[PDB]
Design a protein around this nucleic acid. Sequence first.
RNA 1: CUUGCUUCUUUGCUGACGAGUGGCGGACGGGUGAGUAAUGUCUGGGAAACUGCCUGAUGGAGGGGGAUAACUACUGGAAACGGUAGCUAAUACCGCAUAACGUCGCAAGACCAAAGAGGGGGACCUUCGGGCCUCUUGCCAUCGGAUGUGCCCAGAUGGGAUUAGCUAGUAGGUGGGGUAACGGCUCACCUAGGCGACGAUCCCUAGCUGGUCUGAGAGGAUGACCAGCCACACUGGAACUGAGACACGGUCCAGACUCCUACGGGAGGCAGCAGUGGGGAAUAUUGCACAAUGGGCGCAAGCCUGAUGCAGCCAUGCCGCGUGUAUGAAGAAGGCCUUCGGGUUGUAAAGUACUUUCAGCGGGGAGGAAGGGAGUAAAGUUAAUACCUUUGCUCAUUGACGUUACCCGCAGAAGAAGCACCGGCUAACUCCGUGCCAGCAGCCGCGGUAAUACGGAGGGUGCAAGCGUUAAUCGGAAUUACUGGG
Lengths: 82, 85, 499, 205
Amino acid sequence: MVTIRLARHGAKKRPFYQVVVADSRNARNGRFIERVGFFNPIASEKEEGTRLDLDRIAHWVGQGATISDRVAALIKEVNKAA
Amino acid sequence: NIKSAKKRAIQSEKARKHNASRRSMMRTFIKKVYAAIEAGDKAAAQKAFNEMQPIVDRQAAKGLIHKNKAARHKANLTAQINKLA
Amino acid sequence: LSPYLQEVAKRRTFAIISHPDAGKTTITEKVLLFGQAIGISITTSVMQFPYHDCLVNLLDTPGHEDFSEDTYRTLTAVDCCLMVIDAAKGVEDRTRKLMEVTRLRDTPILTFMNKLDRDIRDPMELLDEVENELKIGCAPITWPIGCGKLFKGVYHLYKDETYLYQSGKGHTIQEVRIVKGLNNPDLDAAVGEDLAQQLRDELELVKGASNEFDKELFLAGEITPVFFGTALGNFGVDHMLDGLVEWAPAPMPRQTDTRTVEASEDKFTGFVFKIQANMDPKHRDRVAFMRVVSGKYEKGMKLRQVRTAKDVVISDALTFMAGDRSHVEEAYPGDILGLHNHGTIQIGDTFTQGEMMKFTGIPNFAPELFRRIRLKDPLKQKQLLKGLVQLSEEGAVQVFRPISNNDLIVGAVGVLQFDVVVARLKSEYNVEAVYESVNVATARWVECADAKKFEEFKRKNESQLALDGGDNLAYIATSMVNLRLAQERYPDVQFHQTR
Amino acid sequence: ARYLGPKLKLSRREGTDLFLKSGVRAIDTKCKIEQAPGQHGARKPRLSDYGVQLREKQKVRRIYGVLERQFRNYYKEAARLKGNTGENLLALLEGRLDNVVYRMGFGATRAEARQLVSHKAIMVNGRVVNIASYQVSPNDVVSIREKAKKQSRVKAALELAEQREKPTWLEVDAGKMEGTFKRKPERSDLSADINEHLIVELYSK
RNA sequence: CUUGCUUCUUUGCUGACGAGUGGCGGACGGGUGAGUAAUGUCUGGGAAACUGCCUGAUGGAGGGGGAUAACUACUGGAAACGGUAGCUAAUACCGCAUAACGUCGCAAGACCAAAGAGGGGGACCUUCGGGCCUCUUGCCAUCGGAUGUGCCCAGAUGGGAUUAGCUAGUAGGUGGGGUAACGGCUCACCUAGGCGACGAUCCCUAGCUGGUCUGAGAGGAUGACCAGCCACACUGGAACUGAGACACGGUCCAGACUCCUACGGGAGGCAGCAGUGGGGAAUAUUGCACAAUGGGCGCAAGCCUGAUGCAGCCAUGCCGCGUGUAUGAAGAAGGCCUUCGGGUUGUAAAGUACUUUCAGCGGGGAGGAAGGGAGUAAAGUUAAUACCUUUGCUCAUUGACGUUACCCGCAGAAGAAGCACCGGCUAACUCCGUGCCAGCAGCCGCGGUAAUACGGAGGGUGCAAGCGUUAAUCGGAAUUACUGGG
Ligand SMILES: Nc1nc2c(ncn2[C@@H]2O[C@H](COP(=O)(O)OP(=O)(O)CP(=O)(O)O)[C@@H](O)[C@H]2O)c(=O)[nH]1
């Protein structure tokens, strides 16, 4: 089963997640098909806080990927009319 | 080892007779048709093939056979019974 | 009428103190029978009990003069007192030292005259010896039959029950039939007429030359009751259990620096008594015997080390069910635990949940410096450079390290250092160190002075220091004249004894 | 980290004035300069190639207050930039925060400027920095916070700033102690005496 | 007995829930590199394939039966752990109907499956068990998509020729069987082939790689931590269940080692997290919590998670800060040298004026927090303003770290500096004590009564909470020369 999920990179007390498409049986930092965008939870207001390419995400939705709760919250953050 | 999920062991014991017993009767019907191959009677071979076909397709339906083993049995056994006839 | 205090009342303490060669081990082994649980004297054992009515704990101790530095601080743990006195031994200097201990805290005392298979003097002579050499009265209840091997019965007065005895019952639990009456001529025929008349005359002398029982004066221990019977014949200790239920009170409050903390409050007061010389199958854990009389346990409770002031989470707590260190179990307050300490907690380190005060314990003494460690088979010194430091935190052993890295002194407060020599033959103990005669005299008085002033004290005689168990530096003790020069040197100190 | 010792013996050892003991007072002549680094100062050394390279390295290090490993890191950051290594190394040494505070006149000596940076007084772009290893970006503004402004220690030491060259690549306000950083310094502007070529030849091996 | 205040037997009728049947997970997560020189890994292709959980499309989901655990009565065993005789349910099991682009077959033709549950309710109908209407979810069959796994070929991936012949299911073919699938994968027959000096067979060693260190580059060692694959789970072998294991915390058999026994027989496998014995020079805590991520199950709430998020220890490595700053000559006391004039330690110390970074104490205090629960409104759905999905909106809220990061205040320079070297290489000099003795040393080497080399004193130099020694890799070493030697 494919899924779109965060990967938990960064340092101790310095999180930096990687939204990525991967199988559920693989590891969190393990093998992935391809990466699309990123998220930084400590990215308070500066030049860039979140990049997220919606084309490949819509392509993986067209394939059957299960979106997790944080990635769905990022989809509701990157709104089509906002 | 002590495990709360040891139920999958003895239930597989509950499997290893019954499903295999079905497999048992399956292959004996197949062997019966081989007796017709050692008999030379094409009518008895056709009767044995008609007897073994729906039960081996039912065994292919219940997850025991992946419907390519039994397909191979139907194929080569049909080839034998129309080469003999 | 909450059940919490109702089973606080069902938790009682009797440790066991006696003379050497009196029968501690046999009577504890036979009280293991009475609850359906089942050199000389080098261990301490705790038996909680699977007993029916209450749950009364035990706490054994080595009985000698060179031994029994355990019991000076664990008779403070135990509310009551059991005495075991033999007739051939009598009231000796061991018993006078134990009564000097027990008079300081006024413990209720029930005594038990042991060895009824041997020869025993007259009972009035023994009670006069007790009441003269202890200056403490007594009230007898029974007296068995005759002298020598003729002891075959027990005659109660406040219970009016006459029991008989059968021989050879040390292995199995057997019952002897009951005769109710006191003036029964069939009892005189079964026992012997003239001996029973002598026993009735002695009971009349008891009724005419003694007193009755008390309840408010039993708490102070002025008139201490006695009990009779043997420890091998499976007979005399079976009647002890009813007295343990009926006579012993609730576990008393104990003194702190502020006031006495009762057995109905919270903030668990379980400080550590011994760090006992452990048997080592795979681990040490050292031991933690405690005083958790106040407060019912929790499985995930978080204790507070007061002397280091740290919130330490301890979830594992061993209960001593029938001697074996049982599973992770919580209990009712009035019990003694065993925890898993790794070089962190010494003797008497207090515990509360925020009351940052101290008790009035630690009666431990100053040692007498015996010889050395000279390390025969000098391979792998690390088993004694670690495993004797494991024993150095204890009240009996305090290892002294001089600067020259050889000739390490074993601290003994007693004389018999055969305990450590036998303890050198364990899984992590393989070095022999046979003894000889080397003279180091007087006790190494431990002292650690305040800052900016002990630095020059280290500087002026830098070849005359010695590391201790726990990173201390006493001075060095070769003679009394050097201690006089040390007192002449004026080491002003925030003094702590550590002994 | 810091030397915190005989900051006057080092100028006698190198011979040139390292500006460690600058102070409110002028050129001292109170330590018998150029003729006594120590006990055996009358000796004339052989003074070889590795000798003059090491003396040049120690001279630049005790001018700029940088330790050996940190200066090797600055050389690694100098060899990677554009242009040439020797100009880049001195630009990185000038880009230290304490050197900027020293050129502004906010403190008499360099150690006093380092102490002024360290004790929560020097603030660049509204962000306070205590460690002197901050790489000063171009087009910044350095100042002193109001709770640490003019407790006289910046004041008289500013008068020494009236006696210095007052270089072109930075401007001080001198009314509210608000400096202004500008473009990177040219090689032909900073002190005109120190030799980067011996440092390059030393760290090339 | 304060007669609706309390005491209390029945009662699955509810919220929920030991044990049992069943579904899923246990094949992921975690640990080690023992074995392995190609059955492994990497790079690049390929077909003779499977694929639960995810999802799209098209149809079905009709009608029945028999057992069984749990539960009862007896009974074997100390325990582990059952047996006999009955009762019962299911999404457990098995037939019957029914099929298509599904399976076989050149076609005609033959055969192949299931399971229902939860919420709300208008009319009708209620033997008052409920049908019926709607929504959600689950099941069966096919075509697919993605993922993961299985399989084949080429190249590359250590040394030894003091390893030159190896192979008999061996090499290939035909036919039978077997695998989700090609396949000597396995059997019957036929021929004598197949590999090999461009290192076949044998021995030793070794997990492979992305990468790490060094090196201008080419190269050399390594691959410990992060990550992918492979292999293993005290040793060996074997199968079942399951889509996926020929299986870490599954089964059986054989062997070794601890433990119990009432001695008839059984329990166990830390190369999991912790922790222990032994080895070694060398390596940690028997800690907190699902607060966040991920995994498993459930519609959801909730449950587990020694992965993880952390906490404790170790200067093991890197980085930063401090141990005061300015001023201060009688150029004080003491030490060392001396040509005994004086110099050095030395603005160093004492004194004076400020400051308190970091520790100690006392108070505020973010962020890692998204969600989830209750209530309300609107839009879908439907007969339905009822149920359910989604979005605003109101309330109570969810932190182990945590006595948190960070900020303010109190006090007092107050609590905080060592290690190597000094003949050259390579940064720095004298005096005293032995005397080819004690001794130093990485190489030239010193010490034989005037030692800048041993030991001590003073001083200086270098690094800095680290400093020296030892061990390993590379460079210098073009002293392995392919770049780049004879
Ligand atoms: N016949 C008989 N012998 C007894 C009795 N009680 C004790 N003994 C004997 O006396 C000796 C006491 O042994 P032990 O139980 O070790 O004494 P102890 O009191 O534990 C010694 P310590 O005071 O040091 O702890 C043993 O030899 C034991 O057999 C008794 O009631 N009868």
